[PDB]
Design an enzyme around this catalytic site. Sequence first.
Site, PDB file in Angstrom:
ATOM      1  N   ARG A  85      29.857  29.792  48.996  1.00 57.50           N
ATOM      2  CA  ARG A  85      30.612  31.008  48.663  1.00 57.50           C
ATOM      3  C   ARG A  85      31.871  31.183  49.539  1.00 57.50           C
ATOM      4  NH1 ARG A  85      24.748  33.984  48.962  1.00 57.50           N
ATOM      5  NH2 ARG A  85      23.892  33.200  46.964  1.00 57.50           N
TER       6      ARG A  85
ATOM      7  N   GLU B 143      17.096  14.952  56.727  1.00 61.54           N
ATOM      8  CA  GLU B 143      16.719  13.566  56.814  1.00 61.54           C
ATOM      9  C   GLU B 143      15.763  13.273  57.982  1.00 61.54           C
ATOM     10  OE1 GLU B 143      20.370  11.237  57.476  1.00 61.54           O
ATOM     11  OE2 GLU B 143      19.388   9.779  58.826  1.00 61.54           O
ATOM     12  N   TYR B 144      16.027  13.901  59.114  1.00 64.36           N
ATOM     13  CA  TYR B 144      15.220  13.684  60.297  1.00 64.36           C
ATOM     14  C   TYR B 144      13.929  14.564  60.287  1.00 64.36           C
ATOM     15  CZ  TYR B 144      18.246  10.496  62.773  1.00 64.36           C
ATOM     16  OH  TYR B 144      18.921   9.402  63.216  1.00 64.36           O
TER      17      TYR B 144
ATOM     18  N   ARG C  10      28.970  19.044  67.688  1.00 63.73           N
ATOM     19  CA  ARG C  10      27.615  18.608  67.257  1.00 63.73           C
ATOM     20  C   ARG C  10      27.015  17.607  68.256  1.00 63.73           C
ATOM     21  NH1 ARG C  10      30.182  14.218  65.369  1.00 63.73           N
ATOM     22  NH2 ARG C  10      28.968  12.365  64.726  1.00 63.73           N
TER      23      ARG C  10
END
Lengths: 155, 155, 155
Positions: free
Chosen positions: C37, C64-65, C110
Amino acid sequence: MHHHHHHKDEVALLAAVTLLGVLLQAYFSLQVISARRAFRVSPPLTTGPPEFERVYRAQVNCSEYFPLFLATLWVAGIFFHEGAAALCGLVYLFARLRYFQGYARSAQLRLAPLYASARALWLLVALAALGLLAHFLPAALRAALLGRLRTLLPW
Amino acid sequence: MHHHHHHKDEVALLAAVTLLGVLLQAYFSLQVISARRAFRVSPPLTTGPPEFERVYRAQVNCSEYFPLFLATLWVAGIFFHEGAAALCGLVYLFARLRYFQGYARSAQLRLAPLYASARALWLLVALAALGLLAHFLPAALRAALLGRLRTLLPW
Amino acid sequence: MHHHHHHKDEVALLAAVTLLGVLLQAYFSLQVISARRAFRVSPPLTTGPPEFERVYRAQVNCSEYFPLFLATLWVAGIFFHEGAAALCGLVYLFARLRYFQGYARSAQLRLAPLYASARALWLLVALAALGLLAHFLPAALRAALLGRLRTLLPW
Ligand SMILES: CCCCCCCCCCCCO[C@@H]1O[C@H](CO)[C@@H](O[C@H]2O[C@H](CO)[C@@H](O)[C@H](O)[C@H]2O)[C@H](O)[C@H]1O
Ligand SMILES: CCCCCCCCCCCCCCCC(=O)O
Ligand SMILES: CCCCCCCCCCCCCCCC(=O)O
Ligand SMILES: CCCCCCCCCCCCCCCC(=O)O
Ligand code: NI
Ligand code: NI
Ligand code: NI
Ligand code: NI
Ligand code: NI
Ligand code: NI
Ligand code: NI
């Protein structure tokens, strides 16, 4: 390695719903492979016509939520109630089948079964949470009362 | 919280195959990170040279099937036979290692080990299904016979 | 189906960390829907502005992990030590929350929580491996000594 008892009969409905879930996921996968032929999309590569991209994305989303579903099913089934957890699991999986089928036809048709799958998953989460709370909260409240008591050697 | 028995010895081979599977998945992930350097693809973003896209896609597909493999391994190992389920699991994982290695070299070289991984996964599914059928079908057949009996208070 | 004992009290901390993990994954998913959005990206389709693609990719990587985390948590918690496995699991999940939050702001942000999540996951893997080794290695060493013995009927 035996064991003169087993706990299979406490988890067999969870195991059956789990296996149904695996079968549904396998089916979604086979539908993507079938869409790759119908709409001529070759591996690697997951871009192609809209109809292919919707089928692909429906499979991806189901795949992503599938461990969440499994984790919560087992926690709810062990800590809250096996039958209730299994029923909710069946409703979730049926909702996911309708989601995938809808989405393949139209983005918009994915929405109603998507909401149904979320309500079933959130109910599983709430049963898991209630079951865990039932497990931990009495001992925790007691340990805290005991530390309070304490006062003591007086009154 | 003890317990003067444990059920570890009934699931240790399943647990070992599970851990091998985690290790293989970690390896696939490290190979994608290594391909990101070799073929200069920076995060986020999963598009780049063909050689990168094949390695990426092999990891994605292994990841997608990995919960299915785990679910079925555990159900087959508990309901059918631990050793059989674990053996099939090893064959599946070796097949997935060959799939990933193949795919990295060529789309076409992914195909033979892909078929081997599917045969091993489907055998796990069939063992899980047979184990569950063995669990539920006798009681179900009996309850139905009992309702039939019934007749009764006559004959 | 009862059973005058249960093994819930041996896995309740694993089950609680598992449920926390499901809740965190659900949260990541809701953040992607919210980014769809904010940055105007419509389903299917997972390409859009950089800020959207980072949020999308953070969710995908966590997803995924997530089965790897669950598998290893349970194996470590059963074979090594429940409390230790659960603690490591909490650290992993907090690290994943920081990873997702970081990544959403910047690819570079990250990285520190990513390394923290990998150290926590690898510690879980090592506890799982040590627990399995403790389970299998004594019987294996004994069977081998016994075959050696053998010699025998002499000396
Ligand atoms: C109640 C329902 C239960 C009934 C039980 C029966 C289950 C049988 C389902 C069949 C599953 C087939 O399994 C599937 O085989 C095909 C080959 O045909 C593989 O497909 C693979 O090969 C083909 C052809 O070379 C490629 O184009 C394709 O891209 C590739 O993925 C799939 O990767 C595998 O998943
Ligand atoms: C991914 C989560 C997997 C969780 C599997 C946990 C199983 C451990 C405990 C097994 C004992 C069975 C408990 C009986 C409770 C019941 O009636 O369902
Ligand atoms: C994702 C699926 C996880 C399933 C884990 C279920 C474990 C619950 C039952 C544990 C008791 C062990 C049963 C012994 C049977 C055997 O010989 O393997
Ligand atoms: C995806 C992996 C799921 C694994 C679930 C395995 C549960 C089977 C064994 C349950 C018995 C509980 C063992 C007690 C050991 C402990 O103290 O934690
Ligand atoms: Ni005995
Ligand atoms: Ni016993
Ligand atoms: Ni005692
Ligand atoms: Ni006991
Ligand atoms: Ni009794
Ligand atoms: Ni008993
Ligand atoms: Ni027991």
